[PDB]
């Protein structure tokens, strides 16, 4: 899991 | 192979994590998960202390010798100083924005689309409603043409989204680099040829003097402040819908203004709220509840997870629509906190108004789920405004 866009 | 306590992608927990959480909060606050190779914290105060500390817990994984692929090194995967320059000119170009000027348009837009909605017999609330705000709002709000939403479009976001969760499988990396590519192709596009207002021609105007180079790693922040601004409140504003709808008596306390909203919008996010991870390096060995955690080891705080927390939050497995005070994460803290959260506040309070004036709104079919433990939403959620 990584929140990167 | 399978978790003892937590398996974000099975299909029984993407229905519902909300559950999971809440044993694994009671049982291993500080938890060792050897598929996703992290610690995972479900506690506010810990979450909260991960984000206020970078440097122990740093958003930068060259740190602990792993290497940035391309298209990502960005404002996102820096820590200070050196995302400071860039942070500061985004915070610059946003805050250089008239937000009353924002809030009349979405309001006249979300007027009209719902107006037309309603001449359907029922429809997608995902696909035909808040997509097409939320692309219409970030673009407006950037100041550039929006791209065209074809299948193609669609095939990137899910690639991109997927990519996310590439730690629980590893094919999606690659697919998630090319949307990331195709994206910054829009982006280059767009700077070569800026309008007149938004926050892009507000970057290029304030980029003398600012410290930032006009390169690939402003390419890369610029993409992921457009794409975190179409799809996150897309993400935030169907599962408030569904709340709402599926909890006895909440619609109509809206509806009847028995509760304002201000702390129903606030409530809304720590209930649930789309962002359910956010992961950092640990640089130096830590204890956190109780847990020897070592340099080199990365750190998700559940942040999803931490705003359901009794430790924090009275009752936190209600909807209380008036809740005071609600101290919530859902907009991160620290160096790294959202840009947009003024945006997306007013892209909630904007879209519920606009319902609240089809008192006669109901679901239409059963949600769908997106298959996605870190960004967590809806890809349909069938819908009549009566
Ligand atoms: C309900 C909607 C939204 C929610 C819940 C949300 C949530 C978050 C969270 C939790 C973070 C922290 C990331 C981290 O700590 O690694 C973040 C960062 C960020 N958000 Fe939002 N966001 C929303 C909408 C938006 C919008 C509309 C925009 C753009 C207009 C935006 C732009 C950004 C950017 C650029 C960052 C990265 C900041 C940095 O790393 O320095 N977000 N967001
Ligand atoms: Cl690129």
Redesign the pocket.
């Known amino acids: 899991l990584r929140?990167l866009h | 192979h399978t978790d003892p306590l937590f398996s974000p992608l099975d299909p029984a927990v993407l229905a519902d994590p909300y559950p999971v959480y809440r044993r694994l909060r009671e049982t291993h606050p500080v938890y060792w998960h050897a598929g996703l190779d992290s610690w995972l914290m479900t506690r506010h105060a810990d979450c909260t202390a991960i984000?206020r500390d970078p440097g122990r817990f740093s958003?930068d994984f060259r740190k602990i010798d792993i290497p940035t692929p391309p298209t990502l090194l960005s404002?996102?995967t820096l820590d200070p100083p050196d995302?400071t320059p860039l942070?500061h000119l985004?915070l610059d170009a946003?805050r250089a924005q008239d937000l009353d000027a924002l809030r009349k348009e979405l309001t006249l837009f979300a007027d009209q689309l719902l107006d037309e909605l309603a001449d359907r017999e029922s429809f997608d609330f995902i696909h035909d409603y808040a997509d097409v705000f939320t692309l219409r709002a970030?673009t407006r709000?950037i100041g550039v043409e929006p791209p065209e939403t074809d299948e193609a479009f669609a095939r990137f976001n899910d690639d991109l989204d997927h990519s996310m969760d590439a730690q629980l499988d590893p094919d999606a990396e690659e697919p998630g680099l090319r949307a990331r590519a195709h994206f910054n192709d829009l982006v280059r596009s767009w700077l070569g040829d800026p309008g007149p207002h938004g926050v892009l021609p507000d970057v290029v105007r304030l980029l003398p003097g600012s410290g930032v180079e006009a390169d690939d790693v402003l390419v890369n922040?610029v993409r992921?402040?457009f794409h975190?601004?179409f799809e996150?409140?897309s993400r935030?504003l169907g599962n408030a819908l569904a709340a709402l709808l599926a909890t006895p008596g909440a619609w109509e306390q809206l509806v009847r203004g028995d509760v304002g909203l201000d702390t129903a919008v606030e409530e809304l996010?720590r209930y649930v709220?789309?962002?359910q991870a956010?992961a950092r390096a640990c640089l130096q060995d830590t204890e956190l509840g109780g847990m020897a955690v070592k340099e080199g080891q990365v750190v998700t705080a559940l942040?999803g997870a931490a705003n359901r927390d009794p430790d924090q939050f009275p009752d936190p497995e209600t909807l209380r629509l008036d809740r005071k005070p609600n101290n919530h994460?859902?907009?991160?803290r620290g160096?790294?906190?959202?840009?947009?959260?003024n945006?997306?506040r007013i892209?909630?309070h904007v879209t519920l108004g606009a319902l609240l004036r089809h008192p006669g709104v109901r679901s239409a079919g059963e949600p769908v789920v997106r298959p996605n433990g870190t960004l967590r939403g809806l890809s349909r959620l069938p819908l009549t405004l009566g």
């Open positions: 929140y | 984000l958003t404002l996102q995302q942070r985004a946003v970030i709000f922040s992921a402040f975190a601004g996150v409140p935030f996010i709220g789309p962002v956010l942040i994460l859902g907009f991160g160096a790294h906190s959202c840009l947009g959260l945006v997306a892209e909630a």
